[PDB]
Design a protein around this ligand. Structure first.
Ligand SMILES: [Ca+2]
Ligand SMILES: [Ca+2]
Ligand SMILES: [Ca+2]
Ligand code: NI
Ligand code: NI
Length: 357
């Protein structure tokens, strides 16, 4: 019978002098056992949802700070670093950004001179969003996800509304604006998933390299690390970290979780007791090797953030349900759905160093 997360040695303490250990949170998780676990095991936080653009500015000038403020106050009180997710993102983006002053959709404008006017209007709206958020939280955020998921999985840039209306200029202007109002001390990240896939890694590298050569202020790369038990490979993960280090960039692991399933997560288990112990052991073996890699590359990695706390709250549950006709759970963390430690906890708290040849 495994002990509860509040009864075992601290993860963040184990990784002192190597990297911070972070968790994604909701404001309603900052009480009770989840808050107890946060304070005991983590020294960095990120808002799972309360700081995304539609949460903060759902309508132009309608600012919703309360939930984000609660996370900031918790980080202040318990000496936790805070990442910011996220200033600019194509996902669930507030539609009002992309509507011109006549009420028409900018993406559909066919007149060239009007398209140029839309580009300037949209960039001003983006600048004002970044300015307002950075001015409020500058002294509380130590890593800014300035742009998120701007590379397409099929190659090249993601053809979101941001890209259709502004080209790459929204990326350039976002970093310049975050630097302007955050100051030279703000640490500015480009965040993405599947950064271990060589073709996507290379596209992100080529984009960031070109931007750096133009003077765009970029300090690091966020690797979301939504991974599986058998994918991606340790060697591809190593290759990706090193390539961005070669540009002088920090690496952060920003949204780590290890699904029990492939992609798509078909054939998900409908109850936690249906999970075979051998599957949690395989997860433990993989987490061991993953954090062994992180230790080897600790000079290149400033923080490792899990996209949640314990298995009772993860976006992977909704992903399982999406692909299994509305039913299904996932178990991606080192703490299980009752807050008891899993085999993976023991394998990343330990000091084992005998290799696995
Ligand atoms: Ca480090
Ligand atoms: Ca779950
Ligand atoms: Ca280990
Ligand atoms: Ni720190
Ligand atoms: Ni090992």
């Amino acid at each position: 019978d495994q002990p509860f997360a509040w009864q075992v040695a601290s993860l963040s303490e184990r990784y002192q002098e190597q990297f911070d250990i972070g968790a994604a949170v909701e404001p309603y998780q900052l009480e009770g056992r989840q808050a107890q676990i946060l304070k005991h095991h983590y020294n960095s936080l990120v808002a799972e949802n309360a700081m995304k653009p539609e949460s903060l500015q759902p309508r132009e000038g309608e600012w919703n700070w309360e939930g984000a403020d609660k996370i900031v106050e918790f980080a202040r009180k318990h000496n936790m670093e805070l990442r910011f997710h996220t200033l600019v993102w194509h996902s669930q983006v507030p539609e009002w950004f992309f509507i011109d002053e006549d009420g028409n959709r900018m993406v559909d404008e066919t007149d060239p001179d009007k398209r140029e006017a839309n580009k300037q209007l949209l960039l001003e709206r983006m600048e004002n969003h970044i300015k307002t958020v950075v001015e409020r939280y500058k002294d509380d955020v130590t890593s800014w996800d300035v742009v998120n998921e701007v590379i397409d999985d099929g190659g090249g840039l993601r053809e979101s509304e941001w890209y259709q209306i502004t080209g790459t200029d929204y990326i350039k202007v976002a970093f310049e604006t975050a630097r302007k109002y955050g100051g030279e001390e703000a640490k500015l990240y480009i965040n993405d998933y599947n950064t271990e896939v060589p073709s996507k890694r290379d596209d992100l590298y080529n984009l960031v390299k070109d931007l750096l050569e133009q003077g765009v202020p970029i300090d690091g790369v966020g690797h979301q690390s939504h991974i599986q038990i058998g994918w991606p490979s340790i060697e591809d993960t190593r290759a990706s970290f090193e390539k961005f280090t070669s540009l002088g960039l920090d690496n952060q692991v920003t949204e780590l979780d290890m699904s029990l399933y492939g992609w798509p997560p078909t054939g998900a288990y409908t109850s936690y007791d249906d999970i075979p112990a051998e599957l949690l052991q395989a997860q433990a073996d993989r987490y061991d090797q993953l954090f062994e890699l992180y230790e080897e590359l600790a000079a290149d990695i400033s923080s490792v953030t899990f996209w949640g706390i314990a298995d009772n709250h993860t976006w992977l549950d909704g992903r399982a349900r999406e692909y299994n006709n509305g039913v299904g759970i996932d178990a991606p963390f080192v703490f299980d759905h009752n807050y008891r430690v899993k085999p993976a906890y023991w394998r990343i708290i330990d000091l084992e160093h005998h290799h696995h040849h």
